[PDB]
Amino acid sequence: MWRSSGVSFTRYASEMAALLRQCLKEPYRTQAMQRNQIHLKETVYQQGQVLTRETFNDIKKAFEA
Amino acid sequence: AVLALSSDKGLCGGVNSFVAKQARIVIKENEMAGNAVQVYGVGDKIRSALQRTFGDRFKRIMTEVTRFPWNFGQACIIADRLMQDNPARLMVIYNHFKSAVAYDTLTLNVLTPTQAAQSAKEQLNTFEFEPEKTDVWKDLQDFYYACTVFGCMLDNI
Amino acid sequence: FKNQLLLTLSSPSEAIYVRTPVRSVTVPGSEGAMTMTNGHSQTVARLKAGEIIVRKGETGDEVERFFLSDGFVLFKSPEDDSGCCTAEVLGVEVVPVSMLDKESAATALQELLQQGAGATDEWTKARTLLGQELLSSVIRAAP
Amino acid sequence: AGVASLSAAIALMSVGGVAQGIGSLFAALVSGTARNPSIKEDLFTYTLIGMGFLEFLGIICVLMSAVLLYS
Amino acid sequence: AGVASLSAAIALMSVGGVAQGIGSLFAALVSGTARNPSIKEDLFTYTLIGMGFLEFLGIICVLMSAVLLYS
Amino acid sequence: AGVASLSAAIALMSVGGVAQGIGSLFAALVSGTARNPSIKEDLFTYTLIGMGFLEFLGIICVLMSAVLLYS
Amino acid sequence: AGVASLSAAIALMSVGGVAQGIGSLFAALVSGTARNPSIKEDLFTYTLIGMGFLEFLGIICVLMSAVLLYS
Amino acid sequence: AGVASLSAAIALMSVGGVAQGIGSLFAALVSGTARNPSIKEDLFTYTLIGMGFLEFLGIICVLMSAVLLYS
Amino acid sequence: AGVASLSAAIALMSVGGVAQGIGSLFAALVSGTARNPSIKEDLFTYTLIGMGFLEFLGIICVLMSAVLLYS
Amino acid sequence: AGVASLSAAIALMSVGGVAQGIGSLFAALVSGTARNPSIKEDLFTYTLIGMGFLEFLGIICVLMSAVLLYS
Amino acid sequence: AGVASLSAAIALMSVGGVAQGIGSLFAALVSGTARNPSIKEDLFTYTLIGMGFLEFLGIICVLMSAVLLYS
Amino acid sequence: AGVASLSAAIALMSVGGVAQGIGSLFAALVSGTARNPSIKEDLFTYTLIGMGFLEFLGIICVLMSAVLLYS
Amino acid sequence: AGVASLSAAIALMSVGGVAQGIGSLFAALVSGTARNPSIKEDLFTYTLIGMGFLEFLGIICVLMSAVLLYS
């Protein structure tokens, strides 16, 4: 399925584990969403001369862009 | 493609120095034969180390990874970014954590789809793949990338 | 050592078992569920979702349930000197069934169906269907 | 003298192939439901289409058997 | 006229084919229950539907056999 | 009530093969749907093309059966 | 006359179609057990349902092998 | 003019024998489209080639049936 | 005893289905043993059970052969 | 010779076994093109070799039939 | 010498099923050896048990031919 | 005197099995080639060996038929 | 009059099933070679044992024809 939609297995697994984490109980759900915080800052280059810089705080937008 | 793992804060001794030293060695060794080199990095320290000398080879850099606890979701993003830019050969430079007062710098020659298609995978014939090998290999390979990044970054931290 | 099954059930955040000796371990393969025991051939398998069911050698009858989203299983033959055959169940998110909920599951299912109603991209439709799968599995698996 | 009965019995014999087809169809249905249990309505719909075709062929052969018997 | 017996016997050959389908159908259950032992219920429903169709086919074959026997 | 009835009955033996082919077709459709639902509208299309032969082929024999019943 | 005995020999041709069904069912049992022994005693029960049909569909024809022999 | 009709009816078996085989071809096409939707063409070309072969075989059998029916 | 001999000969076509079911069972047993040898004996048990049914069917036809060889 | 017209039909019945084989072959071809498309140029070649036999065999199944329509 | 050779050949017709079962069984053996050579000797054994049925049935079959050749 | 033609046709009504076997051969060859192209040189090497028997059987399936037309 | 020729032709029919079994054997052979070439030399050995039965049965069939075409 993911191979046909042009999708990686890592993306599928992460985006499904996100839903599974949403199906948790609150005391454990807090710790689960705590240990899975995401923050990145991608910086694209082309022989120096930075093309763009972009932050990511969500798994979906991190995999899409 | 050389993925150099490093930190973002200072006062870390000289681990990033050794990482960048090994990276310079690898680049100067592989650029003589004519292999076009690309550089991926994790942390601002490697960026500050290699900007002036090998800044015309950067492809994508990530940082602010050590703010929150390291997780598999952080590694899957970097693995996907590596796969979308599928190179012919990948190297990973990081620091192995032997003991609380001893580390060790290493370089991991990592398999790639180009290197996998060129092999019949006769070594895995002993293993019964429940789906067929051709259907499960691309997923096993993505998992391999993610796990590699995960373990390497943990040791470096 | 012993002619048991050396299980290691591992997620990134926590290793529940490392060298636990058991008798039989059920796992939800992509084709279908299957139970690994000692003597089982070397194998690699992809898991889709569902309830791993562990059964220790001391237990026999007593079990342990663990919900897994996605991952792999690696069964490796026993070395000639160890006398024990090993198995590694890697899961991207391995929860116990005690920590699951049926209401938030249905809420997430409803929100997924809402988001996927505007079916334009292949990945959105695929994600909607796979979420339906996993959430139905969670509902059927929760107590 | 009783050739019509022979013809009817010889025409009825396609029920074996019809039943083989129906069994293969519903086996595929059951397997696909065991794999993807969230998709049962579409599988049941396609199974109903196939069963309609196969039942049409079966009723055709039964009608021809009755015709040849009481021509 | 014993000849009218023969025609009836010929119809019974179809029943053999029917059995084959039934076997395949039940295999889909016996595999499915091993592939997904959580449900064990909808598979039985589809199995019963298919078995209803196949039993109807076998029953009309038997009835036609008895008809061609006595007539 | 002669040889024409026997021939028109023997012509019906192909319906079993046609039914087996249709069953294989729709079983493959069901399996492909359970595997990858996201191309349902595609698979059904191809399935119809198959019917464009198989059912038609069966009909030929049925027509020829009547041709053998009033030759 | 003795020709009726041929009808009996025709009634046993459905046998040998039941055998394929039994073989398929018990082979599915064997495979599902080898894959998932933990649920062994469940799968056996399902076979007891399948043999609930085939074991009849065989002997029924055997009864015809008598009924279309002496009559 | 009684043996010709029986000859044609006997020759009609290859129709069902061919529908079996067309069904397998199109089932393989469906499964291939399910396993790799990115390749629709290069599966329909080979399918059409096999269709041409099996259509030629069916044409052969129907032609010989019509021949023997009047010769 | 000519017609009786022909009946006895025709009785022994079901042996093919018996052998096919036997081959299916032993193939499934061999594959399951290749998968999980630790469930050898258990599987063997189930296998023998199925074989009994087939064996019974085989013996049955043999008995009928004797009947159709004399009666 | 009326029996000649039967003989030809029987000689044509083998096409039912022929086409099945051809279908299976091309099915495998499509599956290969669904698994490793980048070597289509290989698989088709091997497929042609198979046809190089089957067509020839099929021609035999035709020729004697026509011969049996004259001799 | 009609009935003798007729019954002989007719009884001998049923060895194709024995050959098919043998082929399926040895194919399962080869596949299992490919998947798990470490229990190679443990599979061959079971296949011999299969022969202990199949060939034996075949033997009976062949014997009956002789019993029908000089009855 | 068309009984010789009838015997030749009946003896010729077994090429379907040869064709099915050849189709299975080449289908498995193509499948195993798509699974592992680098070993093609071996997969062909065994394939021809199988043909080295099948065609030979096919030759018998022809030769006696010609003999049955004259002797 | 054509007793011996017809009986030999009817006996020669099992070659189809024999060829199907041989095809299944060599298909499993090539598949196991693709799955594990390192034990190729072993698998063929077992495959020959299969032939050691199959062709042997086939040989018996031809012998019976030689017995029946001359009484």
Numbering used by the authors:
A (entry chain e): 1 to 65
B (entry chain g): 106 to 262
C (entry chain d): 41 to 183
D (entry chain N), E (entry chain M), F (entry chain O), G (entry chain L), H (entry chain P), I (entry chain K), ...: 96 to 166
Kindly provide excerpts from the paper associated with this entry.
F-type ATP synthases are energy-converting membrane protein complexes that synthesize adenosine triphosphate (ATP) from ADP and inorganic phosphate.
The attachment to F1 is mediated through OSCP, which adopts a fold conserved in prokaryotic and eukaryotic homologs. IF1 in our structure is bound exclusively to the α/β-interface facing the dimer interface, thereby locking it in the ADP-bound state (βDP). The N-terminal IF1 region that contacts the central stalk in the bovine complex is absent in our structure.
